[PDB]
Amino acid sequence: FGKRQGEGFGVDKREKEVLARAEKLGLVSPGKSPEEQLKELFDLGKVVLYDGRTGEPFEGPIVVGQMFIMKLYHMVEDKMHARSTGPYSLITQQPLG
Amino acid sequence: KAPVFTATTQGDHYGEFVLEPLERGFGVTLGNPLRRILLSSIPGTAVTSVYIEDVLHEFSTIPGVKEDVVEIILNLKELVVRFLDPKMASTTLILRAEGPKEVRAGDFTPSADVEIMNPDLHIATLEEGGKLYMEVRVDRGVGYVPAERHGIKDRINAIPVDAIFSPVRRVAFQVEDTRLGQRTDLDKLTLRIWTDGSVTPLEALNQAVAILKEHLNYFANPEASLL
Amino acid sequence: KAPVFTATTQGDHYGEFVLEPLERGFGVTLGNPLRRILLSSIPGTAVTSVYIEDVLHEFSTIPGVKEDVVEIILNLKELVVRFLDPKMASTTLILRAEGPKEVRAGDFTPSADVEIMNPDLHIATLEEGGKLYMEVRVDRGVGYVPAERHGIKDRINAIPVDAIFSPVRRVAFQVEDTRLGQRTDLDKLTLRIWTDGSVTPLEALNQAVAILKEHLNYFANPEASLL
Amino acid sequence: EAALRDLDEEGIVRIGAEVKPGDILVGRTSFKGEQEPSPEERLLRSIFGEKARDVKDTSLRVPPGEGGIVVGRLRLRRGDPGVELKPGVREVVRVFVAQKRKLQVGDKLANRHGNKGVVAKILPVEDMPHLPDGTPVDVILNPLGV
Amino acid sequence: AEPGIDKLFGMVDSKYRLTVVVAKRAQQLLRHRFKNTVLEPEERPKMRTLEGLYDDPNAVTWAMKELLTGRLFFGENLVPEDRLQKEMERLYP
Amino acid sequence: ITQVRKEKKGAGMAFATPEEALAAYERGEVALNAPIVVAGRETSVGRLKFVFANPDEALLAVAHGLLDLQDVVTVRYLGRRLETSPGRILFARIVGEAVGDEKVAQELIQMDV
Amino acid sequence: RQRDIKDEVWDALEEVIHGKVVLLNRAPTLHRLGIQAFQPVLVEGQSIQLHPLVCE
Amino acid sequence: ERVVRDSLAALYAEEDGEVVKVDGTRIAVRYEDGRLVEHPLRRYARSNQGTAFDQRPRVRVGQRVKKGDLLADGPASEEGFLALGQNVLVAIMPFDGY
C-alpha cells in the first residue's frame, strides 16, 4: 500500500468492483473499508487482477505469486515426427517405429 | 466540460499522465487500449549482433573473463541504447577492455548519435591480462524478435542475438473518483508508464496515440452485401 | 499493413463489420473501447416518466385495459422515436383512446417535431368502453438511467421510467487469427452491432469512431510537475 | 558449391557452425557398388556428362530436427597413439552438436507438487491479467487439477 | 459439420450406403476432371484462396454438395456395369 | 453465469409498498437479492428494482455496471412475463442464436435452475 | 532440400488441404472414439491442437 | 543446500583458499596451506542426455574463501542450492480454456 498511496496513487474503481463482489460473497467482512477488504483478500492469496486484453477487472479475485516449476525432458522439438515414404523392415515391408 | 489533461514526468525513465474528468467507466475504456499498444508496438533498440575476436560461438570461453559468452548476451539484450538520429536505424558499436577492469556499457567507444542510458550495466568481470574486443551492430525495430528469426551474415564468427525492442518497461493506467466535474461517478485517469530512457514516457504516449488513431482511421468505406 | 475494413448490413437495424487483417492484439485493443463507448454513449430517443388519467400507483390496475400498468410501461420503453431538429432535445407526446380500440405506437397522438420510427407496436389493448389518457416526456441523452437515478414528476401522479438512451442493443465483438500466405499472426476482428431505429449499423459505428478519435486528440499540452 | 561451406581442410566442420537439419558434418566417401546404370539413366548420364564416378557420397548428414552448432571436434584416426579401432576400420569421428532451445509450444512442465502439463501456446506480454502496479502475470494455471 | 449432413444420412438407409455413393461419384468427378457434374457454377464447391477463388478441387466435397440436390441416381443393380463404362469414359476426356 | 445469488443480509421483511423496500436497499437494511415481501406479494429487491421490456435492455443495464450477472430481476423475454437472472436469460439467448431460433431452444432448457 | 519453403508452397499445400480431413488417434484405442477425423489446420509451433470436448 | 555438495556437482575449496585468477576456464585458488592449486572448469560439456554441465564462477577475482565453500556453480546448482527451474508468478484461473 506504501508503493500506492505513497507513490501518489489511491484506490482504483475496478478494485471497488471486485471488493464489492467479495463483500457480497463473504470473502471480505462487510463494514470494512477497501483498505481492509483488499487486505483480507490479499492475505487470502488472492488480489484484484485486471485484464490486459480489455482492462476491465475480474469479477472474482485470483491467487498469484512465485512458484517453482520445471521444463521436463520430453519436448515436442524432439518427439514430434511425421514421414511419407521411408525405409521398411527387411522381413516384411512394414515401416519402422 | 472539457478534458483537463495533465502530464507529470520524471526524466527519460519515469512518467505520469492524467486525463480528468471522464464519464463513468470511460477511463477504463480509454486507458487500457493505449497501454496495450504501448507495451508492444513502441519502436525500440537493444542490440542485434555481437562479435568478439576470440569467439567462434555463443558457448566459447574467453580467457580472462569470468562470464561465459551468452552469459554476457544476458547483459547485452538488457542493454539500453538510443540513436539521436531518426535516419540511423543501423550503425555499429565498439568495445575494448584489457587488464583487470570491470567491463560495463560505459566502456564502449562513443560515436555519433549513439547513446547509452545505463553506463553501469555490468558486461563482464575481467582478470589480469584478460583482453576483450567487442562490436555490436545495433539496429532499431519493434517488438521481440529472437536471434533465431533474424539472420546476420556479418562474418563467420559473428552471431545474432535476441532483440528486445520497445523502451517501455511496464505500464499501469488507473481509474478513480475525481472531484473535477459537474456530476458524480467520474474518472481521474492516471498513468505509471515506465521507460528505459531510449524513449521518454511522453514520447511513448505520443506515438502510441499516433499508431492508435492511425489504425482507428481504417474505418472509412466498407462494402455492404446484405442477405 | 493495409487493413481492409468491410461491413455487411441488414436494414437500419442490424449490421456486422470486419477489419482484416490486423496485428495480433490490435483487434482486442479495438473491441472494448468501441464496446463500452457504443453502449455507454451515442445519443438516442429515451422516454422518461409517463402520466395516465384515472391511474396513480405504478401497480393499480386500469380498467378497460387488458394489460396492467407496468405491463404497458414495458411497451412504452421498447418504443423508439427521434427529434427532427437538434434544438428540441426534449418533447412531450400525448395519447387518448376510448372504447374497444387497438392502440399501437403509431396510434400515439403526434407532436411538433417528432417522428416515431416504430409505427407498429402493441401499446395497450382496450376492452369494451375502456377509457384512457396519457402523457409521455421524451428526452435525449446517453447511457442507461433506471427509475432510481432520474427523478421526474411533471404531473400530479407521474411514474418515472427507465431511460433507454443508446439505440444500440448489444455488441460483443470477436477477434481471431486469420492467415496470409506465410504468416498467420494477424487479426480478423469482427463486430456484431445492433441498433433499433435511430441510427443505422454504420451510423452507430462511425459515431463511435468519432467519440474515440475525439478523446485521442486530448493528449496535446502537458502540465509539468516533477517529483 | 555452397554445400561444402565449412569443410575447410580434412572434411570437417569448423567449431561454432550452425548445422540446420539436412546439412552435413563429415566427409565419408567409398566406392559405390558398381552396377551398370539403367538404359534411361545411361543415356541420362551421357547427355549431361557428369560421369558415374567410382566413389559415391557416404558422408554423415544431420538428423531431421536436431539443428545445432558444432563444438566438439573429435577425430580418431587409425594409426594414432592411445586409440585402438575396430578390426579393419579406418578413421572415425564423433562430433558434438549443441543447440539453444527456448520454451517451445507444447513442452512438458510441472511444479514440485506433481502437476503435469504441456505449454499450451504462449501469450503476448501486451495482453496479460496484470495488477495495479502494472506487472503482468507470466503463466496462469487453471484450478482444475488442484 | 459438413453441410447437408442430416439430410445426407436421412437420404439412404445405412451410413455405408451413403459413403459408397459419395466415394464412387467423387472418383467419377476426377476421372472426367469435373466435366460431368449436375450442378451449376454457383452451386459447385467454392474454395476461397488469396491467389484466386476457384472451385474446390476436393472431389469429396464435390460429391457431397452434388447429392444434396438429388439430381444424381444411385442404388444397386442400377444399370449394366458394361455399358456404364462405354458411355462414361467416352462423353468426357 | 447461470447461478443465482441470494444474500442473507436483508433476511427478508414485510414492507407495505415497494417504497419501503426501495429506500431500504440503499439503506443496507435489505440485500439486492434478499427474498422479502411487499404487502401480500412475496418478492426480492432486485426483482422489482430492475424491469426490462427486452433482454438486450438487461444486457445494457448489467454490462453498464448497474447490475450483476446473477441477480433476481424481471424481464419480458419471448412474449412472456419472466422473472429470473441476467445470466439465466443469456443462456437461452446463446443457445437459440447458436441454433437459429431461440424459441424451441429456450423451450427445451430449464430456465429456473 | 533445405528449409527454404517459400509461401508459394504454403498456399499450394493449403490447396490440397481444404476439403479432405485427416484421422487423429490417441492410444490406447479402447473406445472407437479413440480415433476421430478432423480438418487439417496449418498452424505454427510444434505441438498439436484439438477440440477440448472430444479430448475426453 | 547440501544436495549440490553430496552430489559432487559443484566444485568447492579443499581448504581455505584465496581466489587469484577467476578465468572462466581455470579457477585458481591459492590455498592457506601456502601451496597454489587451481581447478579447471567443465563449462559447457555434453551430458548423457542433452543438458550440459556448467560451472559458473561465482567467486570474485580475489577474496579468502572458507574450507568447504563453493567456488563454481553447477547446471541445476545455483549458489550451492538446488535450482531446477525459475520462480514465476502464476494466476490460478480458467484463461480462455487454454
Coordinates of all heavy atoms in Angstrom, one line a residue, chain A residues 3 5 31 48 79 83 90:
Chain A
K3 N 3.6 1.7 -1.7 CA 4.0 2.0 -3.0 C 2.8 2.4 -3.9 O 2.9 2.6 -5.1 CB 4.7 0.8 -3.7 CG 5.9 1.1 -4.5 CD 6.3 0.0 -5.5 CE 7.4 0.4 -6.4 NZ 7.7 -0.6 -7.4
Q5 N -0.3 4.6 -2.1 CA -0.7 5.9 -1.6 C 0.5 6.8 -1.5 O 0.4 8.0 -1.6 CB -1.4 5.7 -0.2 CG -0.5 5.0 0.8 CD -1.1 5.0 2.2 OE1 -1.3 6.1 2.8 NE2 -1.5 3.9 2.7
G31 N -18.7 -3.8 6.2 CA -18.5 -2.7 7.2 C -17.0 -2.3 7.2 O -16.7 -1.3 7.8
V48 N -6.7 -8.2 -6.7 CA -7.5 -7.7 -7.7 C -6.8 -7.7 -9.0 O -5.9 -6.8 -9.3 CB -8.0 -6.2 -7.4 CG1 -9.0 -5.7 -8.4 CG2 -8.5 -6.1 -5.9
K79 N 10.4 -35.3 -29.9 CA 9.4 -36.3 -30.1 C 8.5 -36.2 -31.4 O 8.4 -37.2 -32.1 CB 8.4 -36.4 -28.9 CG 8.9 -37.1 -27.7 CD 9.0 -38.6 -28.0 CE 9.5 -39.4 -26.8 NZ 9.6 -40.9 -27.2
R83 N 6.4 -39.0 -41.3 CA 7.1 -39.4 -42.5 C 6.1 -39.6 -43.6 O 4.9 -39.8 -43.4 CB 7.9 -40.6 -42.3 CG 7.3 -41.9 -42.8 CD 8.4 -43.0 -42.8 NE 7.9 -44.3 -43.3 CZ 8.6 -45.4 -43.3 NH1 9.8 -45.4 -42.8 NH2 8.1 -46.5 -43.9
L90 N 13.4 -55.2 -43.3 CA 13.8 -56.2 -44.3 C 12.9 -57.4 -44.5 O 12.6 -57.8 -45.6 CB 15.2 -56.7 -43.9 CG 15.9 -57.5 -45.0 CD1 15.7 -56.9 -46.4 CD2 17.4 -57.6 -44.7

